[PDB]
Subunit: 140 residues, 10 copies
């Protein structure tokens, strides 16, 4: 029913993804992450759990070439279920892309600082803890 072919329908998300170059980053975050004013805010949160973190990550990565992902170390202990789903998804993504997506971890404080350098933060409705990822653009 959209006039745009494909599945990435949001106008802002389409626009920012089409502006990305190598090493530019894009953040997908949860309903409580602060968003620095040095970065564009794309607020997709409708209500609790809608859309979910994974729904957004999944849709964004259909159009974005990802070479790396950064996470808060706190996700491992405090949201292991979501951590594992994300890792599985990034594993499938890299296979589809024909590359290898590098995963790394920093403290959440440091994560928030890195968000200041992204091209945009896409806010989801996710309510679970530390459901935030920085995606880095890259191709082989």
């Amino acid at each position: 029913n959209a006039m745009k072919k494909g599945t990435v329908l949001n106008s802002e998300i389409s626009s920012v993804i089409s502006r990305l170059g190598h090493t530019d980053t894009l953040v997908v975050c949860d309903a409580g992450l602060p968003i620095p004013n040095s970065t564009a805010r794309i607020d997709m949160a409708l209500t609790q759990g809608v859309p979910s973190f994974m729904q957004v990550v999944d849709v964004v990565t259909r159009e974005m070439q990802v070479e790396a992902a950064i996470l808060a170390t706190e996700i491992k202990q405090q949201n292991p279920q979501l951590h594992e789903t994300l890792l599985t998804h990034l594993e499938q993504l890299q296979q589809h892309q024909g590359n290898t997506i590098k995963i790394s971890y920093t403290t959440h404080e440091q994560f928030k600082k890195l968000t200041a350098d992204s091209q945009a933060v896409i806010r989801s409705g996710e309510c679970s803890p530390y459901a935030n990822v920085i995606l880095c653009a890259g191709v082989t």
Copy 2:
């Protein structure tokens, strides 16, 4: 997880609902409706069916006082399931509000013209046909 208490979390939706006065309109539309440039565009559409038309209508009407809804005539025959889900929702809403929500139908052509006068169009990921409603703000005195 959010810093705003309640369930209407979107910043633009909150902002526009808080600016509404009596008889101001807000449109919730499907993935294919054109949006006139005389109106603000709030693009919630992520992908096909996410978020749905009903998810957006429901969330919006938790904060918005609704006195009327306008629909395309075309929805009756071409999307009867969604039509009846929306009518049921508006029926519950009016009860919770303590009023009676007036429903009307115009041609889709005329509907699109009315959208030019709204304060904003909130775009959903809905892909079914004629999944568009104009909500009118109002309360009992």
Copy 3:
């Protein structure tokens, strides 16, 4: 090499196509068409023939659902080779879309007026005559 998957790489074209609704129009024009200030100008012209009219039409239609195309009557006599190439392309596009693209003709003067209502005019490097088309967004339901 581009960070966007697919083949529609231009940021402004991607942006306008993602904002299109049903019956919105998008114009692809040649190097000499005047562009009204009521419409956004996406200037893809690099130099004579680069990119060609057909390159731009082809790329735009890989993302945009097209239900109709409008052309100046003058193209039939004054640019028949390009006219046919475009018709063949629209024939294949409708097949891949699963619909039927309606083609219509107006005077060039009328065509220029219709461009004032489009969302954007994407300017190619094409130098042949009347190499301009208005594409209308639409899908079947």
Copy 4:
């Protein structure tokens, strides 16, 4: 009579609260506090005492999840009545929120510097001395 359900009716206050993330701050101030140009100015002051500092704090905290509050040390000695009323209110808020709101004190000079980092300063009509608080967003 308003078209928005609830009691937080101001359009600008609604807007900024809806934009808050964890650790973002919002300031509620008196009629005399300077407002840095690195922050948004929401001027609610109508006239002396209208609306009061407490009326604004109260209304803001109906929508905002508060995890901490910062005050000038000067409030203790120079506006003890208002100091107490605020502490009692924050006590009731934390109970309603199911958390514990941390209170801390800085010099007024330092307080003014922290206001430079807030998302907005909401100016009240309060005329008593040092009737200024920085509220920090947070949940569990």
Copy 5:
């Protein structure tokens, strides 16, 4: 405590009043009135009843020279108490101004149209019905 001498403390209200010329209008409205986009929106509403319609009218008229007031005919029957309070206040204002303030009534529909031509609409927290007035600037 404010740095501006007097009692009209709001920065936006001060600003618009200082821009008024003869026959320019300023609207003071209730919490439910729609505000046309051809006019500036000064949103003073904090919460239900704060500030009241009368508090705003009173404060605005301390700085503004008023020669006329326009009301919806609906106020007469549906908010007679507020109607009277306003007429008494306008009576005292004209005495203090040394002029005579003309009052007239239009349909609410027509009232809303006239608001499109005003310099600003100052929104109060008033919840009673038809608590809206158009004030017209003028002196002798």
Copy 6:
């Protein structure tokens, strides 16, 4: 004749005075002072001597609560008449305000730097030398 009651009639001056908080500064300057772009420019200068430095200082201080004033050292020797008229005015102002206005002096070079931090510079038509003052907002608690 004006629609604003009182005697501070300028729209920009009214606007900026109403935005002032404690320790914010406002500068009233002469016809030749440079105005940094980090500060708002309110240009009241019509022609030589119109309005005068004192006319502007006087009007501004009818609405502004002043707790301090800063001057160039150079004003003492090079514009002593104006210096003493200003000191007299500040003396009356403090009495009417019920406080005590603190006066200080810096080099003109340093004065210009301090103007970079003010909320606005109100430019007068004054042509005498070093007819510039930084006024600091403040009241007694």
Copy 7:
């Protein structure tokens, strides 16, 4: 003491005069004239009587070539002293310019409508009645 040679010192007035072409108009008005938003507002009013209407007209006409002036008919009866001073000044101006300045009169209502088409309205501190003129740019 100004860096600009000559006597027209205001930055906005200098700017608008330098943009004028033949038949463009510029209004000088009193402290109470409403100023339409279709026109630029240059607010020179400091306080009652400062600067005066004549001070502004006089300064503006040192840089502006004037071919015509329009006045409200009401000036003749209600501000004859100022009317005559203005006429005398326009008489001297035309002699200096080597042309003949055309004077015409319309109703004040019509005058206000004509102000909507000017390039700018320069507001003086004048408090006497109908102290408003539309100046038309022109040279022989």
Copy 8:
């Protein structure tokens, strides 16, 4: 077919070239280069390989006086065919200009940093690796 005489038809390119002074830089880049926000973005990329890096470099240099070019060292080993075509083109350009165009190499990391100081980056559709050049404006005088 265009209203501008000559062969540099793009309005943004024409505009930026006409604002260049001596030592100003202009970047022509491939489809994958990040573009810093301290620089203007001129997005000519339509689709993969259209227009090519060389098409853009060639057209730009028909209006722009070039005194030097900077490349990433990585181009030597990872895009040698394109490297050579560019050097040949710069050789012919310097001859038609009557000067000598200086070529230098930096790491790609350092190249990206230099792009932050250019007046604009013109993005081509090129997909080969390290197809990025910083062109420096200058004339013999």
Copy 9:
């Protein structure tokens, strides 16, 4: 000495010319013409007679393809020397363009109205009367 090759050096002129399409107009005017706010203002006037009307017309027409020119009837009687110099110049221009430039006349009142529809007015320092021309973009095709 400039970084742009050729002789049309102004950045705004270069910019506007590169955006012209067929039938777009560009005005070159004298020091006294009013410029409507519906049109871009390019102020080249430095002082009386610098640059002259003819200097501007000449430079503009080196980049701009002209198909027609409109003048005020008043130029015939009140600036005949300039009228003739312009016609001669348009005669030589059409020869170098290989077309025929149509000249027409309207009242000056009507001329001013047409200027409201141009893409820009380029103001020269010319002081002679009615030294104003509307140039229409076009090429033979």
Copy 10:
């Protein structure tokens, strides 16, 4: 013919000169000088030699009070004829101003840095080398 009396007819030049205070600078430059984006760009260049550097300096100084001028040391050897013309002009200007204009020299690299602090750079059509000057506003008291 112009509606402004006097000889400084350009709207942007008039505007910037009227905003100058003591020690603010204004640059007049040649056709090749790069203009930093921290400064306003007033592009008076029409074509080679039009207007000349001296035309622009002369006109600017009819309105602007000048207390000092800064030049690149390179002008002495590489443009001695223009250097002398400028010095003679500054000699007459100071006489008519009743002051003494201080002239100083820096490296051209340093000159370019100083331009970043000016209020505006007014670009002439001058093609000779190092035809750039920084003028400093000031009057005697």
